[model samples]
Target: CDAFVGTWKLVSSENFDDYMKEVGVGFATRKVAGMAKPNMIISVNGDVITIKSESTFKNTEISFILGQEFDEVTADDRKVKSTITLDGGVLVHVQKWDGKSTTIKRKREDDKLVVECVMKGVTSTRVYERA
Candidate 1:
């Protein structure tokens, strides 16, 4: 997990528009999100981890331990319960709401971090360069 610690700048994203369509990310919200390049801050304290998103449009953060559940309102305004777990240094995140679930994985590749989100067969990939 140390490889994933540090600030990461969003470098690129693919298929995010269609990915959000699987959820209820309003078109209005998507418009605001589209122009924003979010920086992610990944840090840990003891067994708890914190991953925060800082963007020109908005900001959000989640603090929890692996295998524990947390309740949060997602950036798209979905009220959900989420959990994080580790598999081969990749942090697997699952968020559930209204009987729907999305899987997001965060893994480090050298000096970059790749985030992949999947929901209803729609997948979006976001790349980040370590800063």
Candidate 2:
């Protein structure tokens, strides 16, 4: 079992269009995101997964669980009805807001938790060290 019990910050990112497309992101919005960089801060403890995406253009936070279903509010503060679950050692989240699905894989690399989120056609990998 993987335990998320620390503070992690976003350092760098790449490939936004493909990721958004996999999540059913529209062409117009995807065009905008292609030119922007989104940073994420994640904190996990017990059954709670708190994630915040920050950027100069927008910001959003989502808190969910390992087996429970909850709503996800977008960066624009748009509330999207969603559910999250632990599927085969991976955290799978389905958002009804944009009809997007994300699989979060967490692993220990040295002393950091490396999380890779695969969606649409893009893969966004983030690394967070214990703070």
Candidate 3:
């Protein structure tokens, strides 16, 4: 499915500082991340999905499958225990790390795939449009 294939450009984000703070991202890190340009490239084949997240500060590649559990590592190098699935056209990513939990929902909105995240009780939504 083309549901997860394409390059996405970051558009806007809400609650940026609080959201990053909740994730334990340092102030300096947040500053850099705030000004950095991040791009997401995702590909899907059958049940497998691979996501490449690249930015001026960091780059991370992740792979998972719908309904399958996996181990993930964050760009900050934090180890995460996680699972992924698709529900009603939304790709759900649930992760556990450092005794905390987070969820990311990815879906298409117009020519963009929006990513919404909740972590440590803080919510942040980021939008990305096709490039």
Candidate 4:
């Protein structure tokens, strides 16, 4: 968790548009989101962790513990029951909403932070560098 506590800038993304669509994002919003590059800030305080996503179109912040279920409104505006856990050194987030579920995993790879998002059957991968 300590290694994940830092600001990271988006370096690249693959299949994000398709993943957002699978999550029910609007076409217009997906268009904008596909063109936007967001910065993510992760902070770990004892047992609590905060993740902040900052971009020109929208900013979202979420705070939760390792194994607790909480209500969350996703960036695409879906209200979901979310929980986060640590597997090895990877952070995994699972969100369930309206009978649908999305999984996101974050881990450090070499000098970059890699995020893998899966919704429905679509998968998106995003990489970030320390900022």
Candidate 5:
């Protein structure tokens, strides 16, 4: 958690649109998301972690404790049950809804944060730089 405590600006992404589509994001929302450069701030206190994603089109915050299950509404407004865990220095999040599951992994490498999102058969990788 301490390793991820900073603001990060999106540097690059791959197959994000396809991943969003697989997650049921609408065309308009995908358009906005594709064109938007979002900033993510991560903070940790004790056993709780807070992540804030901010963009001109939408802003969202999610707070959770490691290994705890919680209910969440995704940025695209999908209701799901989410759980986050730490694995080998990487933060892994799993969201399940309607019997479908999505996995997100966040890891810090050098000066960048690497995020990977997988839903259905589509996968997206996003890299962020410390800001």
Candidate 6:
């Protein structure tokens, strides 16, 4: 549960909207997200891990233990089956819907949080810092 134990603030992003577009995010949502800097809060209680993304546009969250599959409703309103596991020090997340899937990886680099969002062949890198 202590995998990532802090609140993180988005600092920079590259090709973020395109990555969401590949995952079927509609135009307006992507447009607003392009300008929004979401804060990610990661906390642990017992064996349950909660990761919350907060922003003015919208808020999203997921709670699960490592290696367990759970239902997830994404910010884009995609209803998918999600799973998260640990690969070395990286958090490997996968969400599947409509017979397709996307991967979101989270890793820590000193005080930084690096997120790689992958969909189809498109990948976006979003960097964050602890606050």
Candidate 5 per-residue lDDT, tens place, 1-131, comes to: 89999999999999999999898889998998898789999999888899999988789999999999999887788899999999999999999999889999999999999999998788999999988
Higher-scoring candidate on lDDT, 2 or 3:
3
- Residues 1-131, candidate 1: write the lDDT tens digits: 77888999999999898888887688988888877899999999999899999999789999999999999788888899999999988999999999899999999887789999999889999999977
Backbone clash pairs for candidate 5 read: none
Task: Indicate the TM-score of model 3.
Answer: 0.90
Query: lDDT per model, in order?
Result: 0.90, 0.63, 0.83, 0.93, 0.93, 0.92
lDDT of 4 by residue, 18-94 (tens): 99988999999898888878999999888899999999878999999999999998777889999999999999999
- Pairing residues by index, what is the TM-score of model 4? 0.97
Question: Which residue pairs clash in candidate 2?
Answer: 18-122, 22-120
Give stretches of model 6 more than 4 Å off. 1-3
Q: Which stretches of candidate 2 lie over 4 Å from their true place?
A: 1-3, 24-47, 76-79, 87-90, 97-100, 120-122, 129-131
Model 4 ranges off by over 4 Å: none
Worst 10 residues of 5 by lDDT: 71-80
Which is superior by lDDT, 1 or 6? 6
- Any runs in candidate 1 off by more than 4 Å, and if so which? none
Clashes of each: 0, 2, 0, 0, 0, 0
> What TM-score quantifies how close candidate 2 is to the native fold?
0.59
For candidate 2, lDDT tens digit of each residue in 1-131? Answer: 34544455544455555666676667876676555555556677766778776666667777776666677666434477767676565556665555545665666667766667686556877666655
Cα error of candidate 3 at position 104, Å = 0.8
Each prediction's TM-score versus the true structure: 0.96, 0.59, 0.90, 0.97, 0.96, 0.95
Which RMSD values do the candidates have, in order? 0.9, 4.0, 1.5, 0.8, 0.9, 1.1
Two-way lDDT contest, 2 vs 5, winner: 5
Model 5: what TM-score? 0.96
